[PDB]
């Protein structure tokens, strides 16, 4: 409310609510990815666990944005959450490519919100993103890129072998 | 898949996916309730914590249904998640009345799914609900009813006093 | 005996004795599977251990049915135990396919006995199966389906390699 | 001195000395608030302790600015410290309203100094404020806003009762 | 200086300074190798760690030569450090072949310095090399030769598979 709010633009407030929606949508996408990889006809436990942990991380990012919205005196506003883009996610390679597309969209939204905060001279917002989001995102995208390279190296002429071995020897089970 | 699926009707599979959507919608409603009670112009920490814990419990119930869907060889299907019914939730009394309406709707959906499983002669489904959902729901609704009675006793002619005291002396902070 | 027996039909009593015979036959089949995979010309220790543990689990299921027969005042009656269907079990894939066929036959027998207990209004029998058998069976069939998918992914053009790797990196040795 | 000073404008140096004076004035105001609430005719121990802890926090903020002034090679310059604005502070509500006015003035001074550092291309100054001051201030103002809402809810028709209960059940004694 | 120097030829002093330059150049080459294998488009963590540890070992060898130069009363003289021979290092096989070429050049330089010390009748120099360098080098070259043989065995017709498996199952991650 107006009792605490100071230097917190309506533009930033609305963009924070939109970013919460993006993070919750990302969490829902990773929930779907995780359950897909634990199907009995997919059965890649390490892949399930990789995506189920990202579902939790994106939920936690949304909750940190909502706490910050309250700390600044803005008002959380929730919108409908669209379902994920696919019902079935293909191979581990297809899924990791979809994940890095999703993370680069989150990263661009973070960068756009940082730029709006810079333009609004809102240093608390800019520091909040720098401290809790921007490096987390760069680290995750680097990890996904490392995984993509290793998955791609393993396809060879024996795709099933390579998919098994990546899950067994890189991912956590 | 067809490799494991046995005695698991398409009707139950679809109703489980719908119930996952109801539980995730309930979780999203409790997320909104919790952040509303931590606004600086609402500021009831025990109420925030009560609803934020229910958001986590409803998420966990959705995840247990999704794991069971996979264990039976059905296929998780996600739909859009509608936003909660309100953006602002009024008093603790208004919020607890909305919560018990929400929980009785979840309970009726559980009872309806139990009845479908009974009709389909699916004892694993029926036991799953009895073991992980039906008593959890009766316990929670009893707790909410106890809270409603205590909140109602505290309104008197001093509503703000009563709301403070309930939060301080019943709810966990 | 007639001193304790109450609400325990002769139909359920006989079907419990038949199910004991099915579980003991299953145990004997898994004993044969385990010793086959420890032959020096087969030599897959993780596969031996997987099936030898199922031999013990099926024995224990038969013993829990026999204890329940006594607790209800029925009379255990033992029949001849037929030998397993094969003397040699082929590849790990062949053996896991035979195992899931065997487990779905046990599961159908459990479901049939639950339906008889339901028809006889024998809730102790129905609860006994729900509590100690039906979920154990769904969990095991899901595990076997996961293993089948992973074994099938590993066949590729290098079947021996895939069989080794599954035993080494999925099964316990 | 000139031996270490680099990228540290005379404008920032002077504004840091002014901000030290503001923080020390704030500390002196909170010292007065704390002793007022421990008068025998006021006697609100939790309120005394709340403000006496803020006196220490504002002192520590002044000392961190002075250490930074020295680390950058500027020169601390002290001015007279004006007495607090009141000798008696009224009710807990009056005192919490005066406190949030004081904290929003400190926050605006921090934001103004951040803007000067941005304009001077002094990233060490900007990071120093972001890291040790801006979030501390947003957190404190949110806490005070939460307290104001709870104090206001407790006034009702029984102001003394409400003041007692807030001190007893929210503030630390 | 002349206060301590005894039996320490100007020829050995100069050759020690040259060997320090060779060891520091080797360290810089291994730094480049390590960062190359942690690129997101290379992504072989065990290979990165193998070479980053050799960068540290070659630095430490240079520092032990410099300490000995001082202990004997010679004067350390540093020269420009040439950049490594490549900016990109190819496959793990290419990199391990370049590493063994580099180590055999260091070993030959050690042997040449031992021969100069022998010729100069400088037994402290000869013992220093025998005690801290010659066996370290033979051990490392044997390890690299073992790795080369294993990498070469893994190329087969599936080079990416083999590169992954070597990194996963031989190198430390
Ligand atoms: Cl959509
Ligand atoms: Cl809606
Ligand atoms: Cl037979
Ligand atoms: Cl004054
Ligand atoms: Cl060069
Ligand atoms: Ir910025
Ligand atoms: Ir490992
Ligand atoms: Ir993990
Ligand atoms: Ir039932
Ligand atoms: Ir209590
Ligand atoms: Ir709690
Ligand atoms: Ir039943
Ligand atoms: Ir393992
Ligand atoms: Ir085991
Ligand atoms: Ir800045
Ligand atoms: Ir308390
Ligand atoms: Ir305290
Ligand atoms: Ir020698
Ligand atoms: Ir090992
Ligand atoms: Ir290591």
The whole-angstrom separation of Cα B21 and Cα B32 is 17
Three-state DSSP at D125 gives helix
Dihedral (CA of D64, D66, D67, D69) sign: positive
Establish if C5 belongs to a structural domain. no
- Residue B87 to residue A80, Cβ atoms within 8 A: no
Establish if B88 belongs to a structural domain. yes
Establish if C121 belongs to a structural domain. yes
The closest alpha carbon to E158, from B109, B44, A161, belongs to A161
The closest alpha carbon to C140, from C40, C85, C58, belongs to C58
Residues of chain A neighbouring C146 (CB-CB closer than 8 A): 40, 43, 45
The whole-angstrom separation of Cα A133 and Cα D112 is 25
Taking residue A140's Cβ as centre, other Cβ atoms within 10 Å add up to 17
| Helix, strand, coil in percent for chain C, rounding step 5 | 75, 0, 25
Q: Do chains D and C touch (3 or more CB pairs under 8 A)?
A: no
| Helix, strand, coil in percent for chain A, rounding step 5 | 75, 0, 25
The whole-angstrom separation of Cα C98 and Cα C82 is 16
Residues of chain A neighbouring E163 (CB-CB closer than 8 A): 153
The whole-angstrom separation of Cα A158 and Cα C172 is 25
The whole-angstrom separation of Cα C31 and Cα C84 is 9
Residues of chain B neighbouring D138 (CB-CB closer than 8 A): none
The count of structural domains within chain B is 1
| DSSP 8-class letter at B81 | B
List residues, by chain if needed, whose CB lies under 5 Å from ion ligand 4. Answer: D 82
Resolution (A): 1.2
Q: Do chains B and E touch (3 or more CB pairs under 8 A)?
A: no
Establish if C1 belongs to a structural domain. no
Chain B contact probe: residue of A37, A39, A42 with most B CBs at under 10 A: A39
What is the length of chain D?
173
The closest alpha carbon to A72, from A32, A128, A151, A147, belongs to A128
Taking residue D51's Cβ as centre, other Cβ atoms within 10 Å add up to 22
Structural domain range at position C21: 10-170
Name the strand (E) or helix (H) holding B21: helix B10-37
The closest alpha carbon to E97, from E152, E44, E31, belongs to E152
The whole-angstrom separation of Cα A19 and Cα D24 is 39
Long-range contacts of E128-135 (CB under 8 A, 24+ apart): E128/E68, E132/E61, E132/E64, E133/E61, E134/E107, E134/E110
Q: For residue A45, report the phi and psi dihedrals to the nearest 5 degrees.
A: -60, -45
What is the length of chain B?
173
Establish if A148 belongs to a structural domain. yes
Establish if E78 belongs to a structural domain. yes
Chain B contact present for A39, CB below 8 A: yes
The whole-angstrom separation of Cα D63 and Cα D53 is 15
Q: What angle do CA E162, E165, E167 make, to 5 degrees?
A: 110
| Helix, strand, coil in percent for chain B, rounding step 5 | 75, 0, 25
Assign residue C121 a region: left if phi > 0, alpha if psi is -120 to 50, beta otherwise? left
Give the up-direction half-sphere exposure of residue E55: CA atoms within 13 A in the CB hemisphere. Answer: 15
CA of D145: which chain B residue's CA is closest?
Answer: B40
Establish if C72 belongs to a structural domain. yes
Chain A contact present for E173, CB below 8 A: no
Residue A83 sits in a domain of what CATH number? Answer: 1.20.1260.10
Establish if B74 belongs to a structural domain. yes
Chain D contact present for A51, CB below 8 A: no
The closest alpha carbon to A76, from B84, B163, B102, belongs to B84
């Amino acid at each position: 409310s107006s009792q605490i709010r100071q230097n917190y633009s309506t533009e930033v407030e609305a963009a924070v609510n939109r970013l919460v929606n993006l993070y919750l949508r990302a969490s829902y996408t990773y929930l779907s990815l995780g359950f897909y990889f634990h199907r009995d006809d997919v059965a890649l436990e390490g892949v399930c666990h990789f995506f189920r942990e990202l579902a939790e991380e994106k939920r936690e990012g949304a909750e940190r944005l909502l706490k910050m919205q309250n700390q600044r005196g803005g008002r959380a506003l929730f919108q409908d959450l669209q379902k994920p883009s696919q019902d079935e996610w293909g191979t581990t390679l297809d899924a990791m490519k979809a994940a890095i597309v999703l993370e680069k969209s989150l990263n661009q939204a973070l960068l756009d919100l940082h730029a709006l905060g810079s333009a609004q001279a809102d240093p608390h917002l800019c520091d909040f993103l720098e401290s809790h989001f921007l490096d987390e995102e760069v680290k995750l995208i680097k990890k996904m890129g490392d995984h993509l390279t290793n998955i791609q190296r393993l396809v060879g002429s024996q795709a099933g072998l390579g998919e098994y071995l990546f899950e067994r020897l890189t991912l956590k089970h």
